[PDB]
Amino acid sequence: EALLGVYTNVVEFVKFLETALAAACVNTEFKDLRRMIDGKIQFKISMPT
Amino acid sequence: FTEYAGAIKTITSALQFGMDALERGLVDTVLAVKLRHAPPVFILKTLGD
């Protein structure tokens, strides 16, 4: 006698680009980030008098 | 060439610095003349009537 069961699905959630939190961050898809050691940003601020 | 033309960018931005810090000298010294000739409210109000 073959028996069947009832399974309920995993409740899916709104993705990251579809929330309003991404208005605070700038999103890029860096494909190979496990190869990166460091990443730097360099500012150069000239100051008037 | 990229050492020459990167050295003419320094000496212009050091000399745009000179004039654009001297336009601040107008705005400061014009405001400083006004503050030498600005007696306060409580003195000047009762002389106004």
Automatic annotation (TrEMBL), chain A:
Origin species: Human herpesvirus 8 (HHV-8)
Positions spanned in the full protein: 51 to 99 of 1376
Protein name: ORF25
